[PDB]
Design an enzyme around this catalytic site. Structure first.
Site, PDB file in Angstrom:
ATOM      1  N   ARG A  72       1.482   1.873  -5.584  1.00 25.33           N
ATOM      2  CA  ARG A  72       2.084   0.555  -5.434  1.00 25.33           C
ATOM      3  C   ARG A  72       2.760   0.139  -6.734  1.00 25.33           C
ATOM      4  O   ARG A  72       2.258   0.431  -7.824  1.00 25.33           O
ATOM      5  CB  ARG A  72       1.032  -0.481  -5.035  1.00 25.33           C
ATOM      6  CG  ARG A  72       0.237  -0.065  -3.801  1.00 25.33           C
ATOM      7  CD  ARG A  72      -0.787  -1.111  -3.369  1.00 25.33           C
ATOM      8  NE  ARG A  72      -0.452  -1.682  -2.069  1.00 25.33           N
ATOM      9  CZ  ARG A  72      -0.320  -2.980  -1.829  1.00 25.33           C
ATOM     10  NH1 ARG A  72      -0.554  -3.885  -2.769  1.00 25.33           N
ATOM     11  NH2 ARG A  72       0.050  -3.381  -0.618  1.00 25.33           N
TER      12      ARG A  72
ATOM     13  N   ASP B 244       0.730  14.682   0.376  1.00 29.66           N
ATOM     14  CA  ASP B 244       0.265  15.392   1.558  1.00 29.66           C
ATOM     15  C   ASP B 244      -0.075  16.819   1.175  1.00 29.66           C
ATOM     16  O   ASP B 244       0.748  17.519   0.582  1.00 29.66           O
ATOM     17  CB  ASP B 244       1.365  15.449   2.628  1.00 29.66           C
ATOM     18  CG  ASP B 244       1.568  14.128   3.340  1.00 29.66           C
ATOM     19  OD1 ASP B 244       0.876  13.883   4.354  1.00 29.66           O
ATOM     20  OD2 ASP B 244       2.426  13.338   2.893  1.00 29.66           O
TER      21      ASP B 244
ATOM     22  N   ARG C 247       2.358   0.332  -0.558  1.00 34.10           N
ATOM     23  CA  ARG C 247       2.309   1.712  -1.030  1.00 34.10           C
ATOM     24  C   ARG C 247       3.605   2.440  -0.684  1.00 34.10           C
ATOM     25  O   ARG C 247       4.068   2.415   0.460  1.00 34.10           O
ATOM     26  CB  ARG C 247       1.102   2.422  -0.420  1.00 34.10           C
ATOM     27  CG  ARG C 247       0.842   3.842  -0.922  1.00 34.10           C
ATOM     28  CD  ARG C 247      -0.425   4.378  -0.269  1.00 34.10           C
ATOM     29  NE  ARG C 247      -0.404   5.825  -0.092  1.00 34.10           N
ATOM     30  CZ  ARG C 247       0.235   6.451   0.889  1.00 34.10           C
ATOM     31  NH1 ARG C 247       0.957   5.791   1.782  1.00 34.10           N
ATOM     32  NH2 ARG C 247       0.157   7.777   0.974  1.00 34.10           N
TER      33      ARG C 247
ATOM     34  N   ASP D 204       3.522   8.946  -1.097  1.00 33.97           N
ATOM     35  CA  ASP D 204       2.741   9.748  -0.175  1.00 33.97           C
ATOM     36  C   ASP D 204       2.476  11.112  -0.789  1.00 33.97           C
ATOM     37  O   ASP D 204       3.412  11.787  -1.224  1.00 33.97           O
ATOM     38  CB  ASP D 204       3.515   9.930   1.134  1.00 33.97           C
ATOM     39  CG  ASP D 204       3.783   8.617   1.822  1.00 33.97           C
ATOM     40  OD1 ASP D 204       2.825   8.033   2.372  1.00 33.97           O
ATOM     41  OD2 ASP D 204       4.937   8.146   1.767  1.00 33.97           O
TER      42      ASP D 204
END
Ligand SMILES: Nc1nc2[nH]cc(CCCN3CC[C@@H](SC[C@H]4O[C@@H](n5cnc6c(N)ncnc65)[C@H](O)[C@@H]4O)C[C@@H]3C(=O)O)c2c(=O)[nH]1
Length: 158
Positions: free
Chosen positions: A82, A97, A92, A95
């Site tokens: 953020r 992953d 937010r 990401d």
């Protein structure tokens, strides 16, 4: 074990957030970055008001267990994901992953590896192909074969 991590940020100006996240990934215990893909730009496909995404792939060598690596990526999302610009912290925008974790197959409540949707996402497959063109998935599918079959549109460098 070689873990491949996708990194995306849809902040309007995401370079500093992405670098903070890459620095954070390199500082995870018992791990270190082997290679980082170029940064790629992915425009949004539906509503054109959303910012572009910056996408990249990271090869991380780690001796951590898979769920332990996920704990760290989620910590980094909470700590760096953020951005504050005026009187509030925005939502937010980062990401992280896990796309692949060695040649392991994982299917727990928290973790699905290979990533459940990566085979539909050029913004995952193209950065990964840049750093690991000979990559083979645990079930014997080949990354080059996936890209050959779908002919995804190539993404521009950031
Ligand atoms: N241009 C462009 N670029 C982009 N970059 C990235 C995106 C969408 C990010 C959305 N993505 C964010 C992270 C998780 S969040 C949900 C839960 O998933 C669990 N989980 C299961 N397996 C996991 C794994 N292998 N790694 C990490 N978490 C995993 C976890 O427990 C968590 O609670 C999955 C979610 C998704 O892909 O569905 C995007 C885009 O939209 N456009």
């Amino acid at each position: 074990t070689v873990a491949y991590i996708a990194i995306g940020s849809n902040l309007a100006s995401p370079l500093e957030q992405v670098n903070a996240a890459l620095k954070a990934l390199g500082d995870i215990p018992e791990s270190h970055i082997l290679t980082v893909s170029s940064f790629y730009r992915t425009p949004p496909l539906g509503p054109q008001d959303q910012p572009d995404y910056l996408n990249a792939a990271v090869a991380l060598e780690t001796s951590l267990a898979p769920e332990e690596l996920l704990n760290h990526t989620q910590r980094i999302e909470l700590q760096q994901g953020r951005v504050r610009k005026a009187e509030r912290w925005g939502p937010r925008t980062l990401d992280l992953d896990i796309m692949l974790f060695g040649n392991e197959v994982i299917n727990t409540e928290r973790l699905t590896v290979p990533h459940y949707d990566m085979k539909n996402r050029g913004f995952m497959l193209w950065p990964l192909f840049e750093i690991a063109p000979e990559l083979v998935f645990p079930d014997g599918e080949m990354l080059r074969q996936i890209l050959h079959t779908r002919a995804f549109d190539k993404l521009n460098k950031w």
